[PDB]
């Protein structure tokens, strides 16, 4: 869904965040976004 992770263009992934927050962050790359 246009989920490009810049500097790798790989993917994004809704990850289980702190206090249950719905953060999105991919593997194989140190990246995060609200």
């Amino acid at each position: 869904m246009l989920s490009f992770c810049p500097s790798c263009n790989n993917m994004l992934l809704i990850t289980s965040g702190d206090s249950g927050v719905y953060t999105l962050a991919c593997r194989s790359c140190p990246y995060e976004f609200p």
Partner: protein, 227 residues
Amino acid sequence: LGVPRIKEIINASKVISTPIINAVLVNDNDERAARVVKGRVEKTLLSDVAFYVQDVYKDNLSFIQVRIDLGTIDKLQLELTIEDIAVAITRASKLKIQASDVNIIGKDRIAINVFPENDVFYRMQQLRRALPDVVVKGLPDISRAVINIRDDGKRELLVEGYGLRDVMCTDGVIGSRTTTNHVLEVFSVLGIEAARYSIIREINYTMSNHGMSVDPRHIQLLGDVMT
């Protein structure tokens, strides 16, 4: 209607091809009521009634959001409430969800939330494609109902689907004059002597429009060797 009509009549095979059912209405005019019952029987997919579906995030919410076009209910003359859609989500066993999590927000909006590894992203997206293909109103076994005109002012209802029991069970049709094809579902619904008279009426129909003429009696001997 040729040899591949005689083949499955005498085989009495289960998966028949093109199993249209023939039903005659109650009234004679359209009056915006001859296709109000084709609305009551056609498998009304919700992608024809919805217009815009999207995922809305505040900070901590995982819910897909659905909106309907209320004017399309006015357009194709069908009749249904808004809450029976929210019934029809949890009446879908392929999307393995909890029974009662659904909440309306407004008049033309509806949203369902999900909650639990990595269940979060995957099953809000597997369900994003599996929500806009559910039946919300209509009979769950027919394919595509079509209204037509006969050589008189009376108009009937042609439905290209298997089920016949629930078609007799609906309103606006009369369950006295409703013929069909696929003989061996009449044997389930209408006993045994209706299956014997249906095999008769099928063989001598597909020999009337090929030109050859055998007899009535050579099919009446074939009907009784089966039943």
